[PDB]
Design a protein around this nucleic acid. Structure first.
Lengths: 52, 52, 50, 52, 50, 51, 50, 52
DNA sequence: ATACCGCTAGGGGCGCTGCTAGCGGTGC
DNA sequence: GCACCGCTAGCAGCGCCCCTAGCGGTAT
């Protein structure tokens, strides 16, 4: 599902900060895309939302 | 920051499920947009990512 | 083309008056936007000007 | 009342075409602005909308 | 040559409408694919363009 | 509607040949895209198919 | 990973026999493909091998 | 019967891992091919599928 | 038989771009 | 008032990519 998010500059830089760590530890190039890692954080926030 | 996310159909429906709850409890129409609530979940996942 | 118009309060209320009629007769919500109906009136005034 | 209109490129050029005629016949510079002439055409379209 | 086309919903449904006719008259399954029939219509439009 | 077409090399080159003419006569860059001109030819073939 | 297997005619027919059962119980067409169900049986044989 | 399978990278590496063990214990070269050992695992999975 | 190479045929990711729409700010 | 700029919000075009699925060929 294609989705447009309008996030803060802080959140944007923090996501890029993660990807640069992944690509430094690993990683398969273009496997750790922006859409992937950000969607990974979204679903992560979803499972927490159900907890509380 | 304009951002394109490509999420699962499950995640998409769950986000909409939240908005329908918000608009039923509250809410100011168009204040609880998709981009807002999803970005809210993203930043929520970000603060958790740091905890580990 | 994004355009800024500075119109009278009368014209503004009359345009809103139209939209409220459209949304009462029809209409598809957000299909009869302010920008749309006002641009519709502009082009209407253009064809008359010719 | 400040208003945002999103018009066609044809309509945009035609309005400018008018202003260039006005400023060539007359005119007081900045008196025949874009906002003015376009609002003049809007109200013109309004009075026609009623007659029908 | 692999090609991405972004067509209207009308055109999309009309192409499917054709395939459902072909598979009802004939047809060899998967022989009348979407890519085939649509490419057939493209080349058809090409010869007309000339 | 996103669609994958697998066309001949002849058809592919002919479509590009058209775009190069458009961009030489006109044209607004990226307005005469591949997807656009090819979809224009598809719908053109559709209206003929009905006739 | 694209892989070529050269299996017995018995194994081939048995795999097809499964798919025909799946498509009769369910199923989403083309979701229960040959490659899928056969790869499902391969991984099944892998976990047993361990 | 010639057959195309599209398997996971994990499954692919595990099959190769087996062949490297066979060729180290034994084996007749090219007798323990990829197609053979993988088909051996398939039929193995088939006999299990019937048992349950 | 084995393992490689093509090829249509679909599908979706990915990141950029465009757009309409309404909100605001800036400096003249 | 004027004409630019910015921002969310949502939609989709655009062309690339990788993937599956199944079909064929090929030379060891």
């Amino acid at each position: 599902a294609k989705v447009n998010l309008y996030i803060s500059n802080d959140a944007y830089e923090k996501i890029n900060a993660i990807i640069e760590k992944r690509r430094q530890e690993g990683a398969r190039e273009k496997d750790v895309s922006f859409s992937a890692t950000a969607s990974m954080l979204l679903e992560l926030g979803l499972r927490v939302h159900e907890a509380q």
